[PDB]
Amino acid sequence: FTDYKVADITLAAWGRRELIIAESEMPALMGLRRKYAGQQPLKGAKILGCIHMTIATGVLIETLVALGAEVRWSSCNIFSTQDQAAAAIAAAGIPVFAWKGETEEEYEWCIEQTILKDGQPWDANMVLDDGGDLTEILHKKYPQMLERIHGITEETTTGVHRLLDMLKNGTLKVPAINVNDSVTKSKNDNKYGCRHSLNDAIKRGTDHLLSGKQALVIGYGDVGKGSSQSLRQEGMIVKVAEVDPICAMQACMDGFEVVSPYKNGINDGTEASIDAALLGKIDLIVTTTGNVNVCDANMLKALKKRAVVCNIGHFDNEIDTAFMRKNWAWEEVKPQVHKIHRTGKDGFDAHNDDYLILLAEGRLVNLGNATGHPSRIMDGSFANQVLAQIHLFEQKYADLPAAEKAKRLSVEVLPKKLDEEVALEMVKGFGGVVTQLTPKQAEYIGVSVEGPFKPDTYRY
Amino acid sequence: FTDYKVADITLAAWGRRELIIAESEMPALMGLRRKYAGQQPLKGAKILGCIHMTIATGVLIETLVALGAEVRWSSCNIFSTQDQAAAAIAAAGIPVFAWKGETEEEYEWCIEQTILKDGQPWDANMVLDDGGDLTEILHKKYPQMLERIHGITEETTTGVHRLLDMLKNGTLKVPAINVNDSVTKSKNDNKYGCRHSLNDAIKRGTDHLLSGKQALVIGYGDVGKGSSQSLRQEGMIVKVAEVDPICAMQACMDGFEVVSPYKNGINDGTEASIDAALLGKIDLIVTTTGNVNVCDANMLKALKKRAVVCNIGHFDNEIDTAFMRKNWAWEEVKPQVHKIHRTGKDGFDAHNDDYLILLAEGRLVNLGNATGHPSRIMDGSFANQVLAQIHLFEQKYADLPAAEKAKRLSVEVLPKKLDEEVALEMVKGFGGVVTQLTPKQAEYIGVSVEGPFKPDTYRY
Amino acid sequence: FTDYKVADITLAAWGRRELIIAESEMPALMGLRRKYAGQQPLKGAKILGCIHMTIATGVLIETLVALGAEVRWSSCNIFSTQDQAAAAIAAAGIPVFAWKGETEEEYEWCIEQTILKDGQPWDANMVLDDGGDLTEILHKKYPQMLERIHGITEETTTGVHRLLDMLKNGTLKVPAINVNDSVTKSKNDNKYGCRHSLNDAIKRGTDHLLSGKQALVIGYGDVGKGSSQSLRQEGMIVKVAEVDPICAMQACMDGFEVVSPYKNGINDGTEASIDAALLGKIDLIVTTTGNVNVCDANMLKALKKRAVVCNIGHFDNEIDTAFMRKNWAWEEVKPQVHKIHRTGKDGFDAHNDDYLILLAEGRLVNLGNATGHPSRIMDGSFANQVLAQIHLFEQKYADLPAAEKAKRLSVEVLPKKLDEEVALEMVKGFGGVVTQLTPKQAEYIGVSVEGPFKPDTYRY
Amino acid sequence: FTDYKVADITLAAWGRRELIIAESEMPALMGLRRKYAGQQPLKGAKILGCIHMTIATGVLIETLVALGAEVRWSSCNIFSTQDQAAAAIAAAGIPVFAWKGETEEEYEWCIEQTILKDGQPWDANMVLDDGGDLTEILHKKYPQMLERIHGITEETTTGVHRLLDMLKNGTLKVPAINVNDSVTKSKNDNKYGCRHSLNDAIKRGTDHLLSGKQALVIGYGDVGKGSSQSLRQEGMIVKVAEVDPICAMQACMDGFEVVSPYKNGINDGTEASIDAALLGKIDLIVTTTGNVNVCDANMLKALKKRAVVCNIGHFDNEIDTAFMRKNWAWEEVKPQVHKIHRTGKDGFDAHNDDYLILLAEGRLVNLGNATGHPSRIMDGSFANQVLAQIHLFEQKYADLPAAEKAKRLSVEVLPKKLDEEVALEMVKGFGGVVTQLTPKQAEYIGVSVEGPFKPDTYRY
């Protein structure tokens, strides 16, 4: 078996030990393996997967395989692979092209190695994506391959937005499931995942005390809510920026001060618009938005000396790292930790006090500087992924006539009943006990004893 | 002016001082007053109002009046009136029939005094309701009056459920707005309101230390989430019961142990089904469900000696108080606090150790034993109420032809843009500063610089 | 029985119900009753008591009586009496002179009614004091009475400081126990008591939302630590002022921003020295210091409009209320809540926006606007008081010859073994289980299996 | 330069980058460098140092050198060295013998390499110790060397206990400072250090979700307080065991359930004494005691399957790791992480469900599986160490006449004034501003404007 590329295949036994532990942490995912092992619902599925090559993702991959699928895998970030996970999957005879610390050129080559087998399109018929890079490459460069693909299952808020843009422009060629918007994904992974893994990544990157220091979190969606709590539970003084006044209201009610980097919140792109007094007090800024340039050049100039700067939104353009590459000297402390010397770009003084610490070169900090979300959280997301792969593979869109395709070309979520069944496996993994409604109680609130327990309008 | 009934009209000056302070705590509601005072959009509105006669409700009433409405008011709970609020509204020449500590017969008489003026149906044309008792009385006993009514605006989860049952059965006679499901209502009031006011009510009722004691919260919807945090922030050891596995998963991830009062979560109606070990360690039980008999006779028998029992869901049947009235002696400590002696019903021993403390006779404990949610939280709910009253009054359903009525008979929410404009007023009241998107950023995430910022699918 | 003065004797039955509940919350105190009831160790003790006439203090009083003592009682604050507690103690035939809302003249008359019986010195032989007012009156005005007094047991940090000043000046006439510095007092009452009761008092006084608002706590000793947590757990953004850099370090490490009301912390008494930017953002200031003028005239001028101002340190000169009485109009909202109109002193405008809300006229806010600490916390303090009364009464200082007195005239704390025995009763009241050391473990750490478990140097 | 032993000297540049960052995190320590660089108060000091060879310890070593000292260094734990710190110190030409993952034999050899230079006792005259192993070796094996030594400065609770046993037995040969009991050490390092670093080490070791899981912390001293908060802030359900009822009372008041591993807290050496129900629900046990066998063989047998076991007290005998080495198969997952298979010792099944995860082989888990306390916390401890070294070096005990030695042979703490001056540097490092007392205020509370602010009795 040679159909892989990883950092170091000799890490495989360590990765396999960590997979066996992670299995014990992922009861929804292991439950789907046990339930569906017999029926082989993914027999004949040939899945192109592009998602962080972590231990949790290894458990996802081997669940899809255990259900009958063949896969070809890559990471969706240059710094998110755990090399022992990649090695364990390769050593199992699964095609994987992933290592921690890829270049952009290697990143694109890895996705290509999944799309091509022996220099020709692989007989792919399904896609699992996180962020939409593989989706975009198939649409732009491999339209013939999408002809035979039954669907896309998309992990993340950013990737869903890209799908919806394609659907609205009439350029989306195969149906998708939005896995992100299962409640056991969005309100589990995006929020509690970041709670666990943000302070984990800052500690591993910097070993800084957080207690007593000043943080600014840009955004208060699911990731900004979890991120703010990661920091506040360590004793940080957390301020929150938002453009959405409903998310801002939540921040205030959750006990955070809501501030703008700009005077009166007006971002007109002059230095004069920067609240230099506010930024000069900030010890840590974290971007969580999915948006562009929310920690901009003028904010970076105004930040407190030796502030930590990081991004936990899907892509690195949240922080103006291009400005920092053009203007300032980068001193590497260790992989995914750089001092950015604001003294200029012509070398640096090792003892200069005027620097920022940038984590993971502005890419997803939880996965770049630590191991991302813990397996027990990723269990929810990845149980959704498997159910989404089963649904779209069984629907066989590629085999439908033109007229039938027209009726099914959509971006849909999983039904609430499945969301509830994932949650129940998650709760039992904590040793939680869910109460059964009596028939009188079920009638009184207008639900089945079996669920679903909430209308699709319910926000949790 | 004699067209009222309150406990003590001499409390009016105290209530008016508290209204003036509450005005300074309610910028969304005061904002609507200032914005709409000139246009008088409720000129000709005649509003039957049935909602807790508190200081916050006073500010809501005087906002509707300031916008041109006439009203006739009652409380929707026997114990929720603040007598100084009721006095200040009566002393202003507004018809209100409300006092703290009504009987059921007085409660029904008060609603009837709103419906009748000088012994004849009032020319009502709008309804503001909280829990649906006034809605049900108009439908069952005054159907002729609903001919003239343009709409119902409903405050609470329980009242919405009752409207949706009427809609589904074809018995709803006028269109309604579900005020509850604005995010600035549900995810503000139902959650953060209970955070503030649950521990407040237990302290005022009992003066008990909560720190270090064991709580069981039944339910983990918006109210159970807020309630659990009310108790956990005081240092209670909180366990959470749920029938909805997605809500249970949230509980676990929020750091609570999820338990059932019943062995394996199966309540088959036997004492054998009760987890006597669990209930024997509980110092406080709080019901939050909107369901029936979630703290049942067998649970009450198994509770630890001197446990506190209370309900913060809309109606008192969450706790089996009928069982306690039939079997056990009630010793009143002070209004809305009773020792329930489990020794039997034939008098009580003042020194008996075997009692439970029931708050507010099992009625909404935050309003019964304290003052309910703080005005700054009720600002969101009541700004939505005013917008909903303006919308349904302006739509003039009662004046539509038969064909037009058919098309408009619905239970609807307010548009997200209005929800965001309420939130922004709330955020400014904290001195929060919301960031303005740049045109490039607004294009990048696919929103208008003015919002709305989120799809209607978004759960916050 | 007529040897009392209380607000309303008809409140006695309500107070007695609350005493019987409080007994169930005070296992250390009830434990001392049961242990010592037989031995009557306070037979012949005649105790002048001056401490907040609350329900917890009623349980203390009836414990001293149950051990054989006679008492004559007053409160140590004009607003701290619970009238139902005072009535229950009077109705039991115990001399008590206390009501909520005394004048200064009534306060002094009440202490005098304890000292005098039938217009002559009572045959007092013990003193229980909280703050040192009764101690000072006996020393200044009744030296002949101290001749026959065996000791003083002093509750609070301020009262101990006054005793130590007397000891150092050679003016202290009888030995004292410092009850404050039992760990089951200082690190229980002073800290956790304020955690429970500060936000309780602000809620009862104002019903304000705290979540999302800005607080400044002056001081970070035991009371400032508890006070800061009371506010932070509600979601306040808490800043902390301190003069003690070790207490300030704790604040920083506990996740608070440490600020001064003065520029660079320099209090030179010009308006120019005030950080107007900081004070203009503060929604609540709480003084916790035991010191004078820590919320001074220039700070009060600079505070944000409609800020709440309160004191939870023993005496009201922490806030410059004398400046506010001289310069600004007071509008009473309700007892122990005043709007202080900064527009001037010549009446007020009911609708003026420029006011502060002062709680309890600057006197102890937890007891003034709520019920002070919960009984389960006061159990520790009051178990210490009883043990201290037993010790000094049994030592019989007044009967010692001059030479023997000289050897015993001291301010001492209780032995650690007693501190541990109080704690153990407190832990069992939570249903806590303390582990017993094995003989090998006891030898390994160098302690008896029975304790004491820590050297007297240990700070906990 | 060859007078060292480290893992890999090529790590020196990485370690030096991390020293330069740590300098910016350690203002008390860098303050002492700048203040004392000119006076060279450790000119002629020859310091045997035995303390964790971390980045923070590097900054301590180079401060002592900058003040004039020569040193010879080793770690006080086999797993606590950061190899890049050891390399950076060796590359600076400082003798250090330390690497992560020493054997016991290498550990003893490393201490001996400090004691011997070129095979002969080094002319040592000062000792800096953490845990007392170097102190004990000099007393037992090199008594002649203690003739020349002016003092010992001891870091930790365990090492202080050992010194006090030596003092009491008349076997202590040189005076010592108890650095541990500075407030800026004990109530900073021992508590907040473990808050930061316990969850850090469990995350790096296991990547386990902590939220929603059950923890048992044995002990609630400074380390158990910090440890319990490390876990509770992550959303663990934390139970606390204690033998000291005052520490247990704190636990209850801090919102933790106090339990014993043994029925009624009595461990009589039988499996029957184990609370199997309690231990069967525990997902993580952490020992914090400084005592022996507090997580014993019977507890380990009764623990839930796949529970994590770790020790954050100084020495590994807190957990019965000898029982586990004698009875159960150890599967190494990665360095300092072992699955302990309870199926027996004759190999293991890679897929066995019945295992515990032991971190750092039961050695100090924060240093073994992460990087120990953050530099900003260690700043307090290490500023005290430097002041203690200056004081004992300047007192020159070894040069005193016999009579003078007699009078100075003691275990003492640093004066409070120095403790306050360390704290103030720490507070300024957060950008905290300490308020200056006015002369009137300083007189009112009876302190100097300069401090000290508290009596030596004060516990903070």
Ligand SMILES: NC(=O)c1ccc[n+]([C@@H]2O[C@H](COP(=O)([O-])OP(=O)(O)OC[C@H]3O[C@@H](n4cnc5c(N)ncnc54)[C@H](O)[C@@H]3O)[C@@H](O)[C@H]2O)c1
């Ligand atoms: N690192 C991870 O493990 C992880 C986990 C899940 C999601 N993600 C990524 O995180 C990003 C956010 O995802 P989400 O689910 O929280 O999305 P979301 O839509 O729930 O939240 C994003 C928030 O950012 C706010 N925002 C936008 N522009 C802003 C600006 N200029 N200033 C301040 N606030 C601004 C929006 O109002 C919104 O509330 C996405 O890119 C998503 O793919 C990362």
Ligand SMILES: NC(=O)c1ccc[n+]([C@@H]2O[C@H](COP(=O)([O-])OP(=O)(O)OC[C@H]3O[C@@H](n4cnc5c(N)ncnc54)[C@H](O)[C@@H]3O)[C@@H](O)[C@H]2O)c1
């Ligand atoms: N007191 C107040 O101030 C206040 C505020 C808002 C709403 N309410 C009332 O509170 C109630 C709940 O409102 P909400 O918005 O939280 O509703 P919700 O639907 O958000 O939450 C109710 C929860 O109860 C759970 N539940 C139902 N039966 C249960 C059972 N037998 N055991 C355990 N859990 C069970 C459901 O699964 C659900 O998650 C309603 O009656 C509502 O009108 C009161």
Ligand SMILES: NC(=O)c1ccc[n+]([C@@H]2O[C@H](COP(=O)([O-])OP(=O)(O)OC[C@H]3O[C@@H](n4cnc5c(N)ncnc54)[C@H](O)[C@@H]3O)[C@@H](O)[C@H]2O)c1
């Ligand atoms: N209300 C209650 O129930 C309650 C409870 C116990 C004690 N008390 C009273 O509270 C007060 C404080 O008691 P404590 O035990 O916390 O005392 P403490 O000595 O532990 O704390 C007082 C703190 O105030 C600080 N301080 C002094 N002047 C200051 C200034 N100008 N600015 C900022 N900080 C300043 C000191 O440095 C000290 O840390 C006393 O008067 C005590 O009798 C009240």
Ligand SMILES: NC(=O)c1ccc[n+]([C@@H]2O[C@H](COP(=O)([O-])OP(=O)(O)OC[C@H]3O[C@@H](n4cnc5c(N)ncnc54)[C@H](O)[C@@H]3O)[C@@H](O)[C@H]2O)c1
């Ligand atoms: N890992 C680190 O970074 C770090 C930091 C500081 C100290 N330490 C070490 O941690 C240990 C504890 O230090 P500390 O300052 O907290 O000491 P401490 O004396 O403050 O606390 C130890 C606690 O353990 C309790 N205890 C003893 N035997 C017990 C038993 N059988 N069951 C339950 N509780 C029991 C004691 O009552 C005491 O409260 C020492 O070995 C110390 O040197 C480690």
Ligand SMILES: Nc1ncnc2c1ncn2[C@@H]1O[C@H](CO)[C@@H](O)[C@H]1O
């Ligand atoms: N990063 C670290 N560097 C050095 N010593 C540390 C570190 N973290 C914890 N310690 C010390 O470990 C000691 C226990 O041996 C504690 O007293 C503490 O001071």
